[PDB]
Amino acid sequence: KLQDSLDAGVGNLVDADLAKESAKLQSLQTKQQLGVQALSIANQSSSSILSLF
Amino acid sequence: KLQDSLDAGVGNLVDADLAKESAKLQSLQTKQQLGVQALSIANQSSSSILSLF
Amino acid sequence: LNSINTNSGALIALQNLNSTNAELTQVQQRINTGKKIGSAKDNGAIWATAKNQ
Amino acid sequence: SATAGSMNAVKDSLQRGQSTIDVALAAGDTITDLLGKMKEKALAASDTSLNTASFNALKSDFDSLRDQITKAASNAKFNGVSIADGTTTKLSFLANSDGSAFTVTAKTLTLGGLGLTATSSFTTAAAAKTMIGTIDTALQTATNKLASLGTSSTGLDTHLTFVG
Amino acid sequence: SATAGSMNAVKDSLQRGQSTIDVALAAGDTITDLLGKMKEKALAASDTSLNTASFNALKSDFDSLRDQITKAASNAKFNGVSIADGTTTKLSFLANSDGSAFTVTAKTL
Amino acid sequence: SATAGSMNAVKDSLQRGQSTIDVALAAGDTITDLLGKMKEKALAASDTSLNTASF
């Protein structure tokens, strides 16, 4: 019983809660796509002044 | 439960509403191209009096 | 402003995208090992305590 | 512009230090597993009910893991430089363009850094009973050293982001 | 025309102050994450039920984070001047062509 | 436009009140379960046939 309690304590110490990691993965992939699009919009800025010349 | 409530409060405090940001990005890109065209029309003005001489 | 030699907005957007990619790497490690403290880099005290336990 | 272009060497030094600590952490994982199996062997040897043959096989497995810790500590190097082999007291890494160092104290993982010696073993049940606590202290100091290297690696990562 | 052409130095001073405050804000973000981890370590060490080894490990990580705060505060400079290093009480910046200051009080970190 | 931009603080205070009421509802659920256990304990103790130790 004591060895089972020690293994349970190690699992309480280090194990992660995957149910939150799933929603975190969804939100972070969506945020990556949005950040890539924002980075491309930042890349586009230089071209606008070529029309002035 | 208190930890989840505090995280929800931080999200209420600082998170943005992206659905407004999409329409704002569309209208502001259109306004930026229109501003570049108006600035070019402002650049043109000096040329008209060269024909007077 | 209106520079062609530098683009600070692309630098800030790349910083934000790098932070998002780091968060995705963290979530990917927590998913593929199942531990929120899978190494000493995550948290040395709790990791050493779990190792001794 | 020159000071801004000088930061690439600093980022390279921080990445090199992170790689060295990564190799040292892998060797430390191996050494901790070997220390745990050695505590298993010593605790099994401590019992007085065993016949001589089981005690001899246990001391032989204990000597085998003790040699494995030596070689595993010997192989912990990254491009000929190490933070865990015990060759040097510390490693300094670039922290800014002016040349300020980021000190990283070395943490020896060889048997001599664990308080053990190459000849160390046991031949009687009382010697195994003392070796139980000896391996306890050795595994404890090894985990403390590994935690220190992990904190140093997290500091290298944060300073790299700040330099960028 | 001279008063109009002198404004570029004022604009340069304001951009210089903005860059210095940006570097200080990055160092402050790092210092805040370090302070939060030290809160977690001290709050974990406060529990009576821990054995001596966990308390010693929490003390070691706390000391390491305390040294990291010193380094992150030391490195917060923009070309040799800093608003957060604590080497000066305040930085002044141009506000107009006549030389009026735009005072920015230092915030030691 | 100033009055239209003024509403963000109102929405923030509204959300803060919602969060405070949520924490209060969690504490009330806990207090309700505790009150039910205490009612069961008192109702069990009310019987006279019980011996002193169980009381």
Side-chain angles (χ1 to χ4, degrees):
Chain A
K1 295 200 185 139
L2 177 78
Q3 166 162 219
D4 281 342
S5 296
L6 294 188
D7 293 337
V10 160
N12 287 2
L13 268 175
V14 301
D15 280 334
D17 195 341
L18 287 161
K20 292 181 181 179
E21 319 304 328
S22 49
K24 288 222 298 293
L25 192 77
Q26 312 282 327
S27 278
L28 282 155
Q29 312 201 279
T30 307
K31 184 158 163 223
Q32 184 178 2
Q33 294 318 138
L34 282 178
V36 159
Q37 300 192 18
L39 171 48
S40 179
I41 288 165
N43 296 115
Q44 300 315 129
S45 83
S46 179
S47 64
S48 54
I49 59 151
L50 203 58
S51 296
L52 299 167
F53 276 104
Chain B
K1 274 182 181 73
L2 175 42
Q3 169 154 57
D4 291 358
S5 179
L6 294 174
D7 290 338
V10 159
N12 288 353
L13 266 177
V14 303
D15 266 350
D17 183 290
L18 283 185
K20 301 236 188 180
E21 310 316 334
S22 66
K24 281 214 280 303
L25 170 82
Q26 295 297 109
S27 87
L28 280 151
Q29 293 179 356
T30 302
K31 187 181 188 188
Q32 195 257 309
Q33 315 276 54
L34 274 188
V36 181
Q37 184 178 2
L39 167 64
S40 158
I41 281 150
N43 296 115
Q44 184 178 2
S45 66
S46 179
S47 199
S48 60
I49 62 170
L50 190 39
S51 66
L52 305 189
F53 289 93
Chain C
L1 290 172
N2 290 318
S3 169
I4 62 170
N5 300 110
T6 187
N7 184 353
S8 296
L11 302 183
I12 304 283
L14 192 58
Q15 276 163 30
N16 293 151
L17 186 42
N18 277 348
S19 65
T20 300
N21 277 332
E23 268 167 290
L24 272 179
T25 284
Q26 207 204 150
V27 162
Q28 282 168 18
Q29 309 192 132
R30 296 192 189 194
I31 282 152
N32 64 7
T33 180
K35 293 187 286 185
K36 65 182 181 180
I37 297 169
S39 77
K41 298 185 273 149
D42 292 327
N43 175 314
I46 312 296
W47 175 91
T49 305
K51 274 270 163 153
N52 282 120
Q53 213 177 306
Chain D
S1 179
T3 290
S6 179
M7 302 303 225
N8 303 346
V10 168
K11 293 187 286 185
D12 274 12
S13 185
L14 305 186
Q15 291 165 324
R16 193 185 308 130
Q18 288 194 294
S19 296
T20 303
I21 300 159
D22 273 7
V23 188
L25 292 188
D29 291 331
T30 305
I31 297 169
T32 61
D33 291 331
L34 293 167
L35 284 187
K37 267 134 64 183
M38 275 165 78
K39 202 184 134 180
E40 294 293 328
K41 299 289 94 176
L43 188 56
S46 160
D47 174 352
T48 62
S49 194
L50 296 166
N51 49 31
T52 70
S54 296
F55 182 108
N56 290 356
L58 284 173
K59 85 199 289 303
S60 179
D61 291 331
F62 184 107
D63 294 9
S64 296
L65 317 174
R66 165 208 74 201
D67 299 346
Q68 270 150 39
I69 287 152
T70 300
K71 182 174 72 68
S74 182
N75 284 110
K77 296 183 290 294
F78 181 88
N79 277 227
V81 167
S82 71
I83 205 78
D85 195 336
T87 288
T88 187
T89 59
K90 68 181 178 67
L91 289 192
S92 51
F93 301 105
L94 297 183
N96 189 359
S97 66
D98 54 15
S100 66
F102 182 76
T103 300
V104 185
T105 300
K107 298 293 183 182
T108 300
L109 283 177
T110 62
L111 284 156
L114 307 163
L116 300 156
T117 187
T119 300
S120 179
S121 66
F122 55 70
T123 184
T124 57
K129 210 185 157 144
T130 78
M131 185 63 72
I132 297 169
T134 300
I135 301 299
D136 268 1
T137 61
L139 166 70
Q140 184 178 2
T141 187
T143 62
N144 265 338
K145 293 182 183 293
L146 292 184
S148 296
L149 282 71
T151 300
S152 279
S153 198
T154 310
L156 294 174
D157 213 34
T158 317
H159 202 66
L160 180 85
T161 301
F162 180 79
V163 175
Chain E
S1 292
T3 295
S6 72
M7 294 295 173
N8 314 330
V10 171
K11 302 198 262 183
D12 276 351
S13 187
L14 314 181
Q15 312 201 99
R16 194 154 47 240
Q18 285 209 254
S19 292
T20 318
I21 297 169
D22 278 5
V23 176
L25 292 197
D29 275 311
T30 290
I31 283 148
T32 49
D33 283 34
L34 284 149
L35 285 188
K37 293 187 286 185
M38 284 162 66
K39 189 180 176 217
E40 289 155 20
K41 302 286 190 263
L43 188 153
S46 179
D47 169 2
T48 289
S49 66
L50 288 176
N51 63 357
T52 290
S54 296
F55 180 113
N56 295 354
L58 288 170
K59 182 174 72 68
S60 295
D61 291 331
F62 184 102
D63 293 15
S64 296
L65 297 156
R66 193 209 38 230
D67 302 352
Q68 303 192 33
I69 297 169
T70 300
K71 186 179 289 293
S74 160
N75 281 98
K77 296 183 290 294
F78 193 64
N79 296 295
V81 304
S82 186
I83 193 66
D85 193 343
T87 42
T88 192
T89 66
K90 65 182 181 180
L91 294 174
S92 278
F93 304 96
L94 282 71
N96 189 359
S97 61
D98 67 311
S100 296
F102 192 115
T103 300
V104 173
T105 300
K107 303 286 154 193
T108 317
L109 283 192
Chain F
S1 296
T3 300
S6 179
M7 304 282 184
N8 292 335
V10 193
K11 293 187 286 184
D12 291 331
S13 193
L14 285 159
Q15 294 179 356
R16 186 153 47 241
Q18 293 179 356
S19 285
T20 301
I21 297 169
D22 281 17
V23 180
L25 298 196
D29 271 350
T30 288
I31 297 169
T32 286
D33 291 341
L34 285 158
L35 286 169
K37 284 168 84 190
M38 281 177 33
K39 188 169 164 217
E40 266 187 314
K41 253 70 172 163
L43 170 49
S46 69
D47 174 2
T48 45
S49 66
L50 202 75
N51 78 333
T52 300
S54 304
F55 179 105

Short mmCIF file of all heavy atoms in Angstrom, two decimals, chain D residues 102-139:
data_model
loop_
_atom_site.label_atom_id
_atom_site.label_comp_id
_atom_site.label_asym_id
_atom_site.label_seq_id
_atom_site.Cartn_x
_atom_site.Cartn_y
_atom_site.Cartn_z
N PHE D 102 28.25 34.97 -18.95
CA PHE D 102 27.16 34.30 -18.22
C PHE D 102 27.77 33.05 -17.59
O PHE D 102 27.90 32.02 -18.25
CB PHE D 102 26.01 33.94 -19.15
CG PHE D 102 24.85 33.29 -18.44
CD1 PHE D 102 23.97 34.04 -17.68
CD2 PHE D 102 24.66 31.92 -18.51
CE1 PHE D 102 22.91 33.44 -17.03
CE2 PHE D 102 23.61 31.31 -17.86
CZ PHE D 102 22.73 32.07 -17.11
N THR D 103 28.15 33.15 -16.32
CA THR D 103 28.78 32.02 -15.65
C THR D 103 27.79 30.88 -15.47
O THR D 103 26.62 31.09 -15.12
CB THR D 103 29.33 32.47 -14.30
OG1 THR D 103 30.30 33.50 -14.50
CG2 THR D 103 29.99 31.30 -13.58
N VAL D 104 28.26 29.66 -15.70
CA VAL D 104 27.49 28.44 -15.47
C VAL D 104 28.40 27.49 -14.70
O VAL D 104 29.34 26.92 -15.28
CB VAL D 104 27.00 27.79 -16.78
CG1 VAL D 104 26.10 26.60 -16.48
CG2 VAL D 104 26.25 28.81 -17.63
N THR D 105 28.13 27.33 -13.41
CA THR D 105 28.96 26.47 -12.58
C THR D 105 28.85 25.01 -13.02
O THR D 105 27.76 24.51 -13.30
CB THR D 105 28.56 26.60 -11.11
OG1 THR D 105 28.72 27.96 -10.69
CG2 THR D 105 29.40 25.70 -10.22
N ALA D 106 30.00 24.34 -13.10
CA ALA D 106 30.02 22.93 -13.45
C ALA D 106 29.56 22.07 -12.27
O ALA D 106 29.74 22.43 -11.11
CB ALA D 106 31.42 22.51 -13.88
N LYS D 107 28.96 20.93 -12.60
CA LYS D 107 28.45 19.99 -11.60
C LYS D 107 28.92 18.60 -12.00
O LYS D 107 28.33 17.97 -12.89
CB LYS D 107 26.93 20.07 -11.50
CG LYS D 107 26.40 21.43 -11.06
CD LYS D 107 26.78 21.76 -9.63
CE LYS D 107 26.18 23.08 -9.20
NZ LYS D 107 26.57 23.45 -7.81
N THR D 108 29.98 18.12 -11.36
CA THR D 108 30.61 16.86 -11.75
C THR D 108 29.66 15.69 -11.52
O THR D 108 29.02 15.58 -10.47
CB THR D 108 31.90 16.65 -10.96
OG1 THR D 108 32.80 17.73 -11.22
CG2 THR D 108 32.56 15.34 -11.33
N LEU D 109 29.58 14.79 -12.51
CA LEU D 109 28.72 13.62 -12.43
C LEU D 109 29.48 12.30 -12.38
O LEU D 109 28.86 11.24 -12.38
CB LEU D 109 27.74 13.60 -13.61
CG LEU D 109 26.55 14.56 -13.50
CD1 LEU D 109 25.70 14.51 -14.76
CD2 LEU D 109 25.72 14.24 -12.27
N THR D 110 30.81 12.34 -12.35
CA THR D 110 31.59 11.12 -12.17
C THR D 110 31.44 10.61 -10.74
O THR D 110 30.88 11.29 -9.87
CB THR D 110 33.06 11.36 -12.50
OG1 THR D 110 33.60 12.33 -11.60
CG2 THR D 110 33.21 11.86 -13.92
N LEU D 111 31.93 9.40 -10.50
CA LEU D 111 31.79 8.80 -9.17
C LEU D 111 32.44 9.67 -8.10
O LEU D 111 31.97 9.72 -6.96
CB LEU D 111 32.40 7.40 -9.13
CG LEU D 111 31.68 6.21 -9.76
CD1 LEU D 111 32.70 5.15 -10.10
CD2 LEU D 111 30.61 5.65 -8.85
N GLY D 112 33.52 10.37 -8.46
CA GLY D 112 34.18 11.23 -7.50
C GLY D 112 33.36 12.45 -7.15
O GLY D 112 33.46 12.98 -6.04
N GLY D 113 32.54 12.92 -8.09
CA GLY D 113 31.63 14.01 -7.79
C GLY D 113 30.39 13.57 -7.04
O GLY D 113 29.70 14.41 -6.45
N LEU D 114 30.08 12.28 -7.06
CA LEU D 114 28.96 11.73 -6.31
C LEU D 114 29.35 11.27 -4.91
O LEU D 114 28.49 10.80 -4.16
CB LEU D 114 28.33 10.56 -7.08
CG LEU D 114 27.93 10.85 -8.52
CD1 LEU D 114 27.71 9.56 -9.29
CD2 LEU D 114 26.69 11.73 -8.58
N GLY D 115 30.63 11.38 -4.54
CA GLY D 115 31.09 10.90 -3.26
C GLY D 115 31.50 9.44 -3.24
O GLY D 115 31.94 8.95 -2.20
N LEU D 116 31.36 8.74 -4.35
CA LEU D 116 31.75 7.35 -4.51
C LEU D 116 33.18 7.29 -5.05
O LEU D 116 33.77 8.29 -5.44
CB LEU D 116 30.78 6.61 -5.42
CG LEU D 116 29.32 6.58 -4.96
CD1 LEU D 116 28.38 6.37 -6.13
CD2 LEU D 116 29.13 5.49 -3.93
N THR D 117 33.74 6.08 -5.06
CA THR D 117 35.05 5.82 -5.64
C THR D 117 34.96 4.58 -6.52
O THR D 117 34.03 3.78 -6.42
CB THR D 117 36.12 5.64 -4.56
OG1 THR D 117 37.41 5.56 -5.18
CG2 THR D 117 35.87 4.37 -3.76
N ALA D 118 35.93 4.45 -7.42
CA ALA D 118 35.91 3.37 -8.40
C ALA D 118 35.99 1.98 -7.77
O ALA D 118 35.43 1.04 -8.34
CB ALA D 118 37.06 3.54 -9.40
N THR D 119 36.65 1.84 -6.63
CA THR D 119 36.76 0.56 -5.94
C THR D 119 35.54 0.28 -5.06
O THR D 119 35.36 -0.85 -4.59
CB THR D 119 38.06 0.53 -5.13
OG1 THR D 119 39.17 0.70 -6.01
CG2 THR D 119 38.26 -0.80 -4.40
N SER D 120 34.68 1.27 -4.87
CA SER D 120 33.63 1.18 -3.86
C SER D 120 32.69 0.01 -4.13
O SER D 120 32.26 -0.21 -5.27
CB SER D 120 32.83 2.48 -3.80
OG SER D 120 31.79 2.40 -2.84
N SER D 121 32.36 -0.72 -3.08
CA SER D 121 31.49 -1.89 -3.13
C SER D 121 31.23 -2.33 -1.69
O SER D 121 31.37 -1.54 -0.75
CB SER D 121 32.10 -3.02 -3.96
OG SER D 121 33.27 -3.53 -3.34
N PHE D 122 30.85 -3.59 -1.52
CA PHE D 122 30.57 -4.15 -0.21
C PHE D 122 30.86 -5.64 -0.22
O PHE D 122 30.83 -6.28 -1.27
CB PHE D 122 29.12 -3.86 0.21
CG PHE D 122 28.08 -4.32 -0.77
CD1 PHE D 122 27.82 -5.67 -0.97
CD2 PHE D 122 27.35 -3.39 -1.50
CE1 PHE D 122 26.87 -6.08 -1.88
CE2 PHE D 122 26.40 -3.80 -2.41
CZ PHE D 122 26.15 -5.14 -2.60
N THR D 123 31.15 -6.19 0.97
CA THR D 123 31.46 -7.60 1.12
C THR D 123 30.74 -8.25 2.30
O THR D 123 30.83 -9.47 2.46
CB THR D 123 32.97 -7.81 1.27
OG1 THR D 123 33.26 -9.21 1.32
CG2 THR D 123 33.47 -7.14 2.55
N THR D 124 30.04 -7.47 3.12
CA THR D 124 29.29 -7.99 4.25
C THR D 124 27.95 -7.26 4.32
O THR D 124 27.79 -6.18 3.74
CB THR D 124 30.05 -7.83 5.58
OG1 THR D 124 30.36 -6.45 5.79
CG2 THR D 124 31.33 -8.65 5.58
N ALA D 125 27.00 -7.86 5.03
CA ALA D 125 25.66 -7.28 5.10
C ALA D 125 25.67 -5.92 5.78
O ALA D 125 24.88 -5.04 5.40
CB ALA D 125 24.72 -8.24 5.84
N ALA D 126 26.53 -5.71 6.78
CA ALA D 126 26.64 -4.39 7.38
C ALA D 126 27.21 -3.38 6.39
O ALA D 126 26.79 -2.22 6.36
CB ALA D 126 27.50 -4.45 8.64
N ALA D 127 28.15 -3.82 5.55
CA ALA D 127 28.68 -2.93 4.52
C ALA D 127 27.60 -2.55 3.52
O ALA D 127 27.54 -1.40 3.07
CB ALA D 127 29.87 -3.58 3.82
N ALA D 128 26.72 -3.49 3.18
CA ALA D 128 25.59 -3.16 2.32
C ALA D 128 24.62 -2.21 3.02
O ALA D 128 24.04 -1.33 2.38
CB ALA D 128 24.88 -4.43 1.87
N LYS D 129 24.46 -2.37 4.34
CA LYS D 129 23.54 -1.50 5.07
C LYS D 129 24.06 -0.07 5.09
O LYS D 129 23.27 0.88 5.06
CB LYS D 129 23.33 -2.04 6.48
CG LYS D 129 21.97 -1.72 7.08
CD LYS D 129 21.87 -2.17 8.53
CE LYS D 129 20.79 -1.40 9.27
NZ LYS D 129 20.08 -2.26 10.27
N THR D 130 25.38 0.11 5.15
CA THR D 130 25.93 1.46 5.02
C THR D 130 25.87 1.95 3.57
O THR D 130 25.64 3.14 3.32
CB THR D 130 27.37 1.50 5.53
OG1 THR D 130 28.26 0.95 4.55
CG2 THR D 130 27.51 0.75 6.85
N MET D 131 26.07 1.04 2.61
CA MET D 131 26.02 1.43 1.21
C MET D 131 24.62 1.90 0.81
O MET D 131 24.48 2.68 -0.13
CB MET D 131 26.47 0.26 0.33
CG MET D 131 26.57 0.60 -1.15
SD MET D 131 27.81 1.85 -1.51
CE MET D 131 29.32 0.93 -1.25
N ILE D 132 23.59 1.43 1.52
CA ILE D 132 22.24 1.93 1.26
C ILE D 132 22.20 3.45 1.42
O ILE D 132 21.75 4.18 0.52
CB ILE D 132 21.23 1.25 2.19
CG1 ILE D 132 21.19 -0.25 1.93
CG2 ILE D 132 19.85 1.87 2.04
CD1 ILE D 132 20.42 -1.02 2.97
N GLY D 133 22.70 3.95 2.54
CA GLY D 133 22.70 5.39 2.76
C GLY D 133 23.72 6.11 1.91
O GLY D 133 23.52 7.27 1.53
N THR D 134 24.81 5.43 1.56
CA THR D 134 25.78 6.04 0.65
C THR D 134 25.15 6.31 -0.72
O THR D 134 25.28 7.41 -1.26
CB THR D 134 27.00 5.13 0.51
OG1 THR D 134 27.61 4.95 1.79
CG2 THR D 134 28.02 5.75 -0.43
N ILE D 135 24.46 5.31 -1.27
CA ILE D 135 23.76 5.49 -2.54
C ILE D 135 22.62 6.49 -2.39
O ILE D 135 22.31 7.23 -3.34
CB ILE D 135 23.27 4.13 -3.07
CG1 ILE D 135 24.45 3.18 -3.26
CG2 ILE D 135 22.53 4.30 -4.38
CD1 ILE D 135 25.47 3.66 -4.26
N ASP D 136 21.99 6.55 -1.22
CA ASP D 136 20.98 7.58 -0.98
C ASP D 136 21.56 8.97 -1.17
O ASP D 136 21.03 9.78 -1.94
CB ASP D 136 20.41 7.43 0.43
CG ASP D 136 19.17 6.56 0.47
OD1 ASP D 136 18.77 6.04 -0.59
OD2 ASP D 136 18.60 6.39 1.57
N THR D 137 22.68 9.25 -0.49
CA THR D 137 23.29 10.57 -0.60
C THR D 137 23.80 10.83 -2.02
O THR D 137 23.71 11.97 -2.51
CB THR D 137 24.43 10.70 0.41
OG1 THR D 137 25.44 9.72 0.13
CG2 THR D 137 23.92 10.51 1.82
N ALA D 138 24.30 9.80 -2.69
CA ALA D 138 24.81 10.00 -4.05
C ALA D 138 23.69 10.36 -5.01
O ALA D 138 23.81 11.31 -5.80
CB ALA D 138 25.55 8.75 -4.52
N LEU D 139 22.57 9.63 -4.96
CA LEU D 139 21.45 9.95 -5.84
C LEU D 139 20.86 11.31 -5.51
O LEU D 139 20.45 12.05 -6.41
CB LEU D 139 20.39 8.85 -5.74
CG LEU D 139 18.99 9.14 -6.31
CD1 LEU D 139 19.04 9.19 -7.82
CD2 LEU D 139 18.00 8.10 -5.83
#
